[PDB]
Amino acid sequence: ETLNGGITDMLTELANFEKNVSQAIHKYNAYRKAASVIAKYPHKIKSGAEAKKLPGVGTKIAEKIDEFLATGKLRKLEKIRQDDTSSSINFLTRVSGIGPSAARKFVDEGIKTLEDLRKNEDKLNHHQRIGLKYFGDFEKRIPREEMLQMQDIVLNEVKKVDSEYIATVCGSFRRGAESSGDMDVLLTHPSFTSESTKQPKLLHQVVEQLQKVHFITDTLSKGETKFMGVCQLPSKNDEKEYPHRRIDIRLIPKDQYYCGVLYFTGSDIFNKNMRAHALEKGFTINEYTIRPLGVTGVAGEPLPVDSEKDIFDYIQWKYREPKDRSE
Template identity: 65%
Template sequence: MSKRKAPQETLNEGITDFLIELANYERNVNRAIHKYNAYRKAASVIAKYPQKIKSGTEAKKLDGVGAKIAEKIDEFLSTGKLRKLEKIRSDDTSSSINFLTRVTGIGPAAARKFFEEGVKTLEDLKKIEHKLNHHQQIGLKYFEEFEKRIPRSEMQKMEALILQELEELDSEYIGTICGSYRRGLLICSKSEKLIQKLKCFLNFIFRAVNHVSKLYLNVFVYISLYRLIPKDQYYCGVLYFTGSDIFNKNMRTLALEKGFTLNEYTIRPLGVTGMPGEPLLVDSEKDIFDYIHMKYREPKERSE
């Protein structure tokens, strides 16, 4: 079972790789989201560091790298491995659940359920394919493709093709390629891999949209499927699917502190009883930032 790569290749790729692996373990197996966020934040900060890290002490000077993570960095730099990861990889439960969550559409809870039913590998999943939902079936079918990373230059060509197709079908359509591509990373993750498949579906999808209510003027592309989003929800969707997940979590937390609830569909004010009110008008991503009094951050500044 191969491990996931960090968001992009860096001078400290070995360190970011093991931090991402630990993060996935904490999220998928232990369901410890706070630890997941801590490892992800440390990996993101280290990925941006312009020099090769030589010690845990050096890493600890970076915001988001605490004493325990610094100790792990020292261990990795001195031995080339991490005892905790060796133990995790040798544990059948941990390794199987982590692997299953790499299939698009299978989250930690579903992965554990499948494991308890004796499902551990892709071959096992294929035997119960009839039990998978449509999203999971797509994830299984295109597993190898979704695992690959795409150079940014290739993504730019795909983006041009898709937006050209949109323009030819109807000048009112707008589209945004999100995820790590929009955040400016050099290597794009599986969340954008769908674009290679999308061209075959475009004519069908967009011609079908012509028969849908004019509320659905915008088409939003999401992992392994297309998604039709009403135009009044478009920018909340763009914000959410651009990520990163940690940035989204922090922004949603701030929104709550300011008296709003924010998700991929809408931003709503919270009433005195804590119940959300009517969705607020959103004509751009910046509108969302303004509502919660947060300084606007360009997509390239959201890779936390």
């Protein structure tokens, strides 16, 4: 956590660099387990060789340690840190829509800067077009004060649309978070459960409303279960307009909301921690259910959940407020 900081950290630099600038998934895989092990590593690495003992540590990575321990730096991370071609891939990739592959191609054609990106809006596709178009807004944080105005409206149409609908703004915002990056609407409905051969309009009806009133401004990807877009607060009685924010809404078969909800309400840790335990408590929890476990090694049999609570009791525990699901 701190005893092996740089090490894991340098490691990750190196790895991320292997995966992005270079399409060397293996080496990339090298650095991660490694960086993962030295990480569990309970003592101060004193040298290459010491580390070298561990699994995942070969000679190359060992080699890197020494030099890092020796000169408080690293040549390659130095060289790399400098290199535009790579500096560039590190950068372009920040536009929603540009992944590494594209990142590379762009550069190749010589598309290094944001401006480059504009002059070639032609080369870009819808996601990435909207991507660049809200480069600023998408990089900003969502003040909770705003989180609440948004939540306010979402719930309102959703409801005006059909009352039978259930919505939940999940994620950090749900867990108190002073700010949030993207908004997460978990959505389900009675009519939609595990079986009932869908009803796409369910997603659809809503997406539209939200657009009609003018909250949803753009579309990144609408699907029959996951619409994914951009929204904005009604720039008041002017002067201060609102930043465009990333919004996401997904339909859920009503018979899987709570787990689902438990889940997206995080955190990553409270989550695992809960999962790791449900296990002890003779169960299993995943993004959608809670099945009683059985001795042949594994079982099934999806227990019926009516609230975050049900899931709780099931593994027999104390309800944990969103506010306090920190870990």
